[PDB]
Design an enzyme around this catalytic site. Sequence first.
Site, mmCIF file in Angstrom:
data_model
loop_
_atom_site.group_PDB
_atom_site.id
_atom_site.type_symbol
_atom_site.label_atom_id
_atom_site.label_comp_id
_atom_site.label_asym_id
_atom_site.label_seq_id
_atom_site.Cartn_x
_atom_site.Cartn_y
_atom_site.Cartn_z
ATOM 1 N N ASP A 2 48.913 -39.104 86.078
ATOM 2 C CA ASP A 2 48.512 -39.825 87.283
ATOM 3 C C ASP A 2 48.681 -38.906 88.501
ATOM 4 O O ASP A 2 49.502 -37.993 88.469
ATOM 5 C CB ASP A 2 49.330 -41.104 87.445
ATOM 6 C CG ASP A 2 48.462 -42.341 87.537
ATOM 7 O OD1 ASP A 2 47.309 -42.227 88.008
ATOM 8 O OD2 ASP A 2 48.927 -43.429 87.137
ATOM 9 N N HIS B 212 44.472 -36.817 83.246
ATOM 10 C CA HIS B 212 44.389 -38.106 83.949
ATOM 11 C C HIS B 212 44.373 -39.366 83.086
ATOM 12 O O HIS B 212 43.998 -40.420 83.572
ATOM 13 C CB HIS B 212 43.155 -38.138 84.852
ATOM 14 C CG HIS B 212 43.252 -39.134 85.973
ATOM 15 N ND1 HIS B 212 44.188 -39.030 86.981
ATOM 16 C CD2 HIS B 212 42.530 -40.244 86.250
ATOM 17 C CE1 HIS B 212 44.041 -40.036 87.827
ATOM 18 N NE2 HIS B 212 43.041 -40.788 87.406
#
Lengths: 213, 229, 229, 229
Positions: free
Chosen positions: B206, B202
């Site tokens: 995304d 992350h």
Amino acid sequence: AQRLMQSKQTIPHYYLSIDVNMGEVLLVRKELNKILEGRSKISVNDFIIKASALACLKVPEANSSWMDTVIRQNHVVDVSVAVSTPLITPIVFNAHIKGVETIANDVVSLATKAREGKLQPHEFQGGTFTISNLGMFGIKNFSAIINPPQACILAIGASEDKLVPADNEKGFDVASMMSVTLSCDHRVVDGAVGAQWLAEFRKYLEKPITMLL
Amino acid sequence: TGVFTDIPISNIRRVIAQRLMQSKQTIPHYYLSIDVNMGEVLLVRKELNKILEGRSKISVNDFIIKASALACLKVPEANSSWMDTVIRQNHVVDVSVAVSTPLITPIVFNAHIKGVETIANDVVSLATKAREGKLQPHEFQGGTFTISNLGMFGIKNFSAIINPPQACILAIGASEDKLVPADNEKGFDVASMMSVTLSCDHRVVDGAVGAQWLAEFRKYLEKPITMLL
Amino acid sequence: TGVFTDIPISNIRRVIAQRLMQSKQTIPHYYLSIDVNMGEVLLVRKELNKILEGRSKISVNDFIIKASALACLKVPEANSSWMDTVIRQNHVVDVSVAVSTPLITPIVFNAHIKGVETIANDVVSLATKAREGKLQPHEFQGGTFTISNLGMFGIKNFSAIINPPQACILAIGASEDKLVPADNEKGFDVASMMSVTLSCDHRVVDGAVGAQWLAEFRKYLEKPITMLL
Amino acid sequence: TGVFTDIPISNIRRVIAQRLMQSKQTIPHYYLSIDVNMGEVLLVRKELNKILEGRSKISVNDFIIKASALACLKVPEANSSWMDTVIRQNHVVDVSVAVSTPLITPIVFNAHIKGVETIANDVVSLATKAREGKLQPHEFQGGTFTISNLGMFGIKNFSAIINPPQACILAIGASEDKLVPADNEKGFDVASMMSVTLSCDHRVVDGAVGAQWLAEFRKYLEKPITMLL
């Protein structure tokens, strides 16, 4: 003409043949074309490429070249497609690896660069194999001569509808048949292995999922 | 005896413990999940096993490898690594399989290319070299991906922590038999379901792309012939 | 090419990466989950869209906003922020929507008050100002809540990490068709199900209240007219 | 009023907050999950309640205690603690129950031995001493395990963070009615399902044993008479 006169005056040619039942490949081709958005068409010719390449892996000596001192056996498969032109010959590079759709897109982008435009000399080099099909023209069967660095050609006939024996009440059913011929060098390909090669090719096409293995 | 007892902490256990403490103290983890309808893969697996002489068994795990690799190609950013200066994105897929051991981790090299049966033989020869014998250090290097499945043990769902060079893990649950809605007279039918979870870095993945990755993986497994493309 | 390739780390990506690394290294996260039976909301959404001329579409996402806001009123401590000296509890509800972008985050201001259609128009005008144009910095301030849904991408379930001024996130899964038990002759019927997960700060949200929050949210959505109360 | 309001941070809340911030910043957590078919336990619970005069009620929670304790015996490493020098493995099972309170945590001592009804009476007498009265500090010591259930609040599934002396938590979901496949004429039947999640330390619990633990727990509850063995 020099390539042809030279190679048919040197290489000891011989001709092996089979029939390949193309129905299952027709089902899978219809389906993968349905699953693609129409983003890319896929021809039967691409399955022909994929399989002949994997067979070249399973039986290496049909995929080698006769140099005068030693026989040269190459672990990567290039495959050159013999496309008719008012005889341009694009090569699909490393087809033993890439998937069927990238092979299809490769052969079209190569055809667009060929039929009405110049290609770089680098693509004419006759690397390690050749498919050559004349089923569009309705030829049933034919035996080609090969280009001298290589040891073999694959010639594909027209697909047709023959009445094979069956087990149902009628006692028979229709089948799609492709007659496939294969020329060989015969200093490097003894007949039992040319046959072995034709065997594996026949199985990758009769039973298309085994292309996954 | 007594109320408690102690044993010295193992060395290799401290190595692994350092890897785990480090990575769960650095990487910002998050967990995406789906269900994958495994029936069609079960048919093809039964058939390719029938066609093989018994010369080699093929597990469901191999399809899992093949697909996750091809998906890493379709959506590259789930298959990359976070170096502090630049994000490093690698065009070859290695995949490391997290095998339980009384946690040895063989790597399947260049799985994006090789076929399903050579992947199966590779993972067994690597397991034989691991479970009861020493492996070369070169195979423990954690290259570019990790599958980790606990469906044999009956776990339904689980979320793992990842090893820090990489950005993701794939955790596979037990296959099960759920009653999905259908169009026939009964109004329903049985289905094999695998719950599949996917952890991500992350900073590099995304959520929309982690999802895209899970999407392609789902399609290569729901519709196994598209592995040919 | 080569086995790997590198690209420089983006600036905004480092800003987001700092937000994520910081918050997952500070806030003690935990994950609560439920299923929400979305059929009734589907009926009301179909109807209010029929009654509107097509002057404005209304998504399911707007009901999601309206309800989560009213729930923040019913159970205030899920809608507060952890400052180091005192816990700060705010009586107005801002809600920020986590929209994916090639992660722009518009805030819907004072959603606890405004009606569902003005919320829908607000989120679209904010999306138009975001997806292909610059927004004022004032809209990125992460005010007091965040919804984040990935049902469009087919994700079934997922747990996000939260942005540090706030104490919670709402992650919405894909809507699906499950076979629940019934009382009719068949003995069962189809139902639309949304799996909804909720992360919390857990210095401010103890588990019974996180659950209370999820309870009210579940009731405002299972029984949409009670949004009028 | 105003847009926001503040209240001073509580002392005990800072104690708990320190426990939580510390443990989620140190222990490398991970989450395993299963489903447990609770019908048979429901039959035995109904019956033992019928046989008791009403002299004492028995909850499902007590079976949960008894089983998780016996499982801690069958697979000891899920019932141990990570001290920095050596892993400490304790042959007696204490189990602490996480009871919500306007988070008091009574410990059931030596639950591996005592029977289900004495466990039920112990947890009630401990709850009476907790919910409205002071407890001795000696009961808050977090000894060797923790069950924590939120099925009363309708939570379906949730993953907790653990308290640092220990290595695991058991989080229990709501019991529900799912349509499993069957062999009768209808082709299906209703089943009571509890989703059970289990967090682990993962320097001491490798995934195969966390799974083994969950396995035994599942069998003591699916087949309640084997609690006699």
